[PDB]
PDB file of C-alpha atoms in Angstrom:
ATOM      1  CA  UNK A   1      -0.125  -0.006   0.115  1.00 42.18           C
ATOM      2  CA  UNK A   2       3.106   2.150   0.749  1.00 42.80           C
ATOM      3  CA  UNK A   3       6.925   1.996  -0.058  1.00 41.97           C
ATOM      4  CA  UNK A   4       9.151   4.324   1.534  1.00 42.84           C
ATOM      5  CA  UNK A   5      12.989   4.747   0.633  1.00 40.93           C
ATOM      6  CA  UNK A   6      15.833   6.506   2.408  1.00 41.12           C
ATOM      7  CA  UNK A   7      18.346   7.387  -0.078  1.00 37.83           C
ATOM      8  CA  UNK A   8      21.774   7.935   1.528  1.00 37.76           C
ATOM      9  CA  UNK A   9      25.594   7.826   1.416  1.00 36.90           C
ATOM     10  CA  UNK A  10      27.774   5.601   3.904  1.00 39.33           C
ATOM     11  CA  UNK A  11      30.850   3.544   4.489  1.00 38.79           C
ATOM     12  CA  UNK A  12      31.435  -0.304   3.592  1.00 37.68           C
ATOM     13  CA  UNK A  13      31.607  -0.867   7.465  1.00 33.87           C
ATOM     14  CA  UNK A  14      28.494   1.204   7.878  1.00 31.53           C
ATOM     15  CA  UNK A  15      26.715  -0.847   5.395  1.00 31.43           C
ATOM     16  CA  UNK A  16      27.392  -3.934   7.102  1.00 31.96           C
ATOM     17  CA  UNK A  17      26.208  -2.596  10.310  1.00 29.73           C
ATOM     18  CA  UNK A  18      22.883  -1.470   8.524  1.00 26.77           C
ATOM     19  CA  UNK A  19      19.901  -4.195   9.291  1.00 30.40           C
ATOM     20  CA  UNK A  20      16.896  -4.445  10.972  1.00 30.96           C
ATOM     21  CA  UNK A  21      17.757  -5.558  14.755  1.00 35.39           C
ATOM     22  CA  UNK A  22      21.090  -4.428  13.999  1.00 35.67           C
ATOM     23  CA  UNK A  23      22.908  -2.282  16.950  1.00 35.12           C
ATOM     24  CA  UNK A  24      25.821  -0.326  16.763  1.00 32.39           C
ATOM     25  CA  UNK A  25      27.336   3.255  16.348  1.00 32.17           C
ATOM     26  CA  UNK A  26      25.692   3.701  12.868  1.00 30.76           C
ATOM     27  CA  UNK A  27      22.240   2.376  13.930  1.00 30.17           C
ATOM     28  CA  UNK A  28      22.030   4.396  16.776  1.00 28.11           C
ATOM     29  CA  UNK A  29      23.453   7.792  15.965  1.00 28.64           C
ATOM     30  CA  UNK A  30      23.059   8.455  12.283  1.00 29.93           C
ATOM     31  CA  UNK A  31      20.803   5.952  10.652  1.00 29.48           C
ATOM     32  CA  UNK A  32      18.459   3.687  12.545  1.00 29.63           C
ATOM     33  CA  UNK A  33      16.489   0.625  11.345  1.00 25.96           C
ATOM     34  CA  UNK A  34      13.817  -1.368  13.789  1.00 24.08           C
ATOM     35  CA  UNK A  35      13.765  -4.432  15.147  1.00 22.37           C
ATOM     36  CA  UNK A  36      10.746  -5.208  13.416  1.00 23.95           C
ATOM     37  CA  UNK A  37      10.899  -4.304   9.631  1.00 23.81           C
ATOM     38  CA  UNK A  38       9.401  -5.304   6.274  1.00 25.42           C
ATOM     39  CA  UNK A  39      11.463  -4.200   3.282  1.00 25.61           C
ATOM     40  CA  UNK A  40      14.953  -4.566   1.586  1.00 23.13           C
ATOM     41  CA  UNK A  41      18.150  -2.867   2.361  1.00 23.16           C
ATOM     42  CA  UNK A  42      20.117  -2.323  -0.842  1.00 22.84           C
ATOM     43  CA  UNK A  43      23.694  -1.314  -1.584  1.00 24.39           C
ATOM     44  CA  UNK A  44      26.593  -0.135  -4.322  1.00 23.60           C
ATOM     45  CA  UNK A  45      30.153   0.853  -4.268  1.00 22.80           C
ATOM     46  CA  UNK A  46      30.585   4.287  -5.253  1.00 23.42           C
ATOM     47  CA  UNK A  47      34.296   4.899  -5.573  1.00 24.12           C
ATOM     48  CA  UNK A  48      34.021   6.383  -8.854  1.00 23.87           C
ATOM     49  CA  UNK A  49      30.926   8.581  -7.993  1.00 26.56           C
TER      50      UNK A  49
ATOM     51  CA  UNK B   1      14.549  -5.197  30.024  1.00 27.56           C
ATOM     52  CA  UNK B   2      16.920  -3.076  31.695  1.00 25.26           C
ATOM     53  CA  UNK B   3      20.174  -5.614  31.535  1.00 30.87           C
ATOM     54  CA  UNK B   4      20.155  -6.961  27.974  1.00 28.64           C
ATOM     55  CA  UNK B   5      20.963  -5.267  24.489  1.00 28.76           C
ATOM     56  CA  UNK B   6      17.384  -4.390  23.365  1.00 31.39           C
ATOM     57  CA  UNK B   7      16.841  -7.058  20.588  1.00 31.57           C
ATOM     58  CA  UNK B   8      17.985  -9.634  22.765  1.00 32.13           C
ATOM     59  CA  UNK B   9      16.125  -8.545  25.345  1.00 32.14           C
ATOM     60  CA  UNK B  10      13.069  -8.671  23.342  1.00 30.57           C
ATOM     61  CA  UNK B  11      13.629 -12.338  22.488  1.00 28.68           C
ATOM     62  CA  UNK B  12      14.221 -13.414  25.765  1.00 27.59           C
ATOM     63  CA  UNK B  13      11.398 -11.497  27.355  1.00 27.32           C
ATOM     64  CA  UNK B  14       8.924 -13.101  24.622  1.00 28.95           C
ATOM     65  CA  UNK B  15      10.384 -16.612  26.016  1.00 28.88           C
ATOM     66  CA  UNK B  16       9.563 -15.670  29.491  1.00 26.06           C
ATOM     67  CA  UNK B  17       6.242 -14.344  28.541  1.00 27.06           C
ATOM     68  CA  UNK B  18       5.400 -17.597  27.300  1.00 29.95           C
ATOM     69  CA  UNK B  19       6.731 -19.466  30.159  1.00 29.85           C
ATOM     70  CA  UNK B  20       4.725 -17.309  32.682  1.00 29.67           C
ATOM     71  CA  UNK B  21       1.654 -17.961  30.316  1.00 35.87           C
ATOM     72  CA  UNK B  22       2.253 -21.654  30.452  1.00 32.61           C
ATOM     73  CA  UNK B  23       2.621 -21.540  34.503  1.00 31.03           C
ATOM     74  CA  UNK B  24      -1.138 -19.679  34.433  1.00 31.06           C
ATOM     75  CA  UNK B  25      -2.594 -22.302  31.787  1.00 30.98           C
ATOM     76  CA  UNK B  26      -1.433 -25.080  34.032  1.00 29.55           C
ATOM     77  CA  UNK B  27      -2.756 -23.736  37.135  1.00 31.36           C
ATOM     78  CA  UNK B  28      -6.094 -23.189  35.503  1.00 32.06           C
ATOM     79  CA  UNK B  29      -6.476 -26.468  34.018  1.00 31.26           C
ATOM     80  CA  UNK B  30      -5.520 -28.073  37.280  1.00 29.49           C
ATOM     81  CA  UNK B  31      -7.838 -25.691  39.508  1.00 29.09           C
ATOM     82  CA  UNK B  32     -10.609 -26.292  36.886  1.00 31.69           C
ATOM     83  CA  UNK B  33     -10.416 -30.014  37.191  1.00 32.19           C
ATOM     84  CA  UNK B  34     -10.169 -29.942  40.678  1.00 31.93           C
ATOM     85  CA  UNK B  35     -13.103 -27.583  40.731  1.00 28.38           C
ATOM     86  CA  UNK B  36     -15.183 -30.286  39.000  1.00 28.48           C
ATOM     87  CA  UNK B  37     -14.450 -32.703  41.821  1.00 32.24           C
ATOM     88  CA  UNK B  38     -15.005 -30.032  44.525  1.00 31.71           C
ATOM     89  CA  UNK B  39     -18.423 -29.515  42.872  1.00 30.03           C
ATOM     90  CA  UNK B  40     -18.927 -33.095  42.634  1.00 31.91           C
ATOM     91  CA  UNK B  41     -18.239 -33.037  46.483  1.00 32.06           C
ATOM     92  CA  UNK B  42     -20.573 -29.983  47.137  1.00 31.94           C
ATOM     93  CA  UNK B  43     -23.037 -31.844  45.507  1.00 32.73           C
ATOM     94  CA  UNK B  44     -22.757 -34.929  47.511  1.00 30.45           C
ATOM     95  CA  UNK B  45     -22.896 -32.502  50.494  1.00 30.37           C
ATOM     96  CA  UNK B  46     -25.700 -30.950  49.637  1.00 31.47           C
ATOM     97  CA  UNK B  47     -27.719 -33.980  48.831  1.00 35.98           C
ATOM     98  CA  UNK B  48     -26.914 -35.614  52.260  1.00 35.43           C
ATOM     99  CA  UNK B  49     -27.793 -32.061  53.719  1.00 35.78           C
TER     100      UNK B  49
END
């Protein structure tokens, strides 16, 4: 019924730290996901951009 | 809830809620069966009276 999208730039270790239920430095002070999520976490390496 | 990293706390809390529920269900069933015996006894007592 609804789709939301959060488009943002992060480091590779930060990519690893972003997931539902995943606590840690990025999750609590920069970009937070819930402990209950329906959706997709999608990422690409942007060394040339 | 005040001791564990919240997502781990959530899982263990639900495990304990289920455990406490099972203790209540057990109690009610046992008291319900005993109540049937007590009712039968009460009916006999009423009959004798």
